[PDB]
Amino acid sequence: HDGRVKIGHYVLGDTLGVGTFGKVKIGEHQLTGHKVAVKILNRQKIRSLDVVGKIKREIQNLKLFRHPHIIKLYQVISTPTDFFMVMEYVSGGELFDYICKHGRVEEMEARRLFQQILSAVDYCHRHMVVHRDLKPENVLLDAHMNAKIADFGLSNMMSDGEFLPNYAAPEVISGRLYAGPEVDIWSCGVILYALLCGTLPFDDEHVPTLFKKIRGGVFYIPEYLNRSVATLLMHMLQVDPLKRATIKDIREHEWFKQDLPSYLFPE
Numbered sequence: 001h002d003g004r005v006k007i008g009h010y011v012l013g014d015t016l017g018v019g020t021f022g023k024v025k026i027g028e029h030q031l032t033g034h035k036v037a038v039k040i041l042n043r044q045k046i047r048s049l050d051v052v053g054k055i056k057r058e059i060q061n062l063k064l065f066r067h068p069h070i071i072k073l074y075q076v077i078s079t080p081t082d083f084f085m086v087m088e089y090v091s092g093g094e095l096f097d098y099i100c101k102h103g104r105v106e107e108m109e110a111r112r113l114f115q116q117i118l119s120a121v122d123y124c125h126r127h128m129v130v131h132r133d134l135k136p137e138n139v140l141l142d143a144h145m146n147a148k149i150a151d152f153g154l155s156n157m158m159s160d161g162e163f164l165p166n167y168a169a170p171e172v173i174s175g176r177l178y179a180g181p182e183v184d185i186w187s188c189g190v191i192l193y194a195l196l197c198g199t200l201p202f203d204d205e206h207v208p209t210l211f212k213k214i215r216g217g218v219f220y221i222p223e224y225l226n227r228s229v230a231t232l233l234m235h236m237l238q239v240d241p242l243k244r245a246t247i248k249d250i251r252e253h254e255w256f257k258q259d260l261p262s263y264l265f266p267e
């Protein structure tokens with residue numbers, strides 16, 4: 001365009017996010033104008049931290065992902081200085097920004113979106129070569145108001161969005177040994193809570209109250225929230241990882257199972 005901003009059949013445009021190993025830009029197919037999200041991974045930075053083998057395993061794994069609520073990877077072009085991962089672009093932006101701008105979602109809508117998000121999470125638990133911790137900010141919305149999660153491993157490029165940072169599951173901030181899948185449940189309870197209440201369940205610019213609040217596990221349940229969904233939020237936000245719901249427990253909860261497509265949880 002103005003310069004060397006074309007790669008393959010694509011033209012690169014504005015930066016949407018920055019990550020450890022590079023950045024993600026909006027792109028467009030040069031013949032059709034169709035938008036894509038191009039993660040550009042800086043291979044010298046990869047060599048620097050000596051994670052060449054892990055990056056390649058992750059890219060190879062992600063090439064084969066196929067799930068209706070995970071951003072697709074269309075193509076990978078590698079050059080001596082970068083890998084370009086041409087990915088699906090989704091127009092709705094990030095779920096938390098949406099909620100922030102429009103406030104809470106109606107309950108049925110919260111449940112639709114929640115069932116899509118947890119199916120994608122479960123698929124990642126099953127397929128990521130290495131488990132890494134879900135990042136709530138990676139949950140995005142497509143043009144049809146459906147959830148789409150952007151990959152959140154080493155090549156995660158998800159960077160910022162709005163206003164209302166210090167935030168993690170109880171056992172993580174207490175500096176205890178922990179298991180990724182259990183912390184992911186807690187993070188999904190924070191996502192469900194924000195869809196239903198239009199706020200985070202622990203809010204607090206004072207980073208000690210916040211943390212005490214988190215390990216304390218005290219959260220507000222608005223009057224309009226029913227009790228069948230209140231029990232789910234409580235079992236997902238259990239401070240004690242050994243007491244916290246698993247994905248199977250969520251699957252059997254009455255509020256969740258309502259009107260749930262089977263192809264979302266095969267087995």
Ligand SMILES: c1cc(-c2cnn3cc(-c4ccc(OCCN5CCCCC5)cc4)cnc23)ccn1
Binds near residue numbers: 039071091093101140
């Ligand atoms: C990281 C990010 C992505 C990615 C794919 N699509 N995509 C889309 C966006 C995006 C981000 C912000 C957007 O803003 C839309 C405008 N509104 C206004 C504010 C409230 C909701 C959003 C729209 C789209 C961001 N990242 C991605 C893909 C892979 N890795």
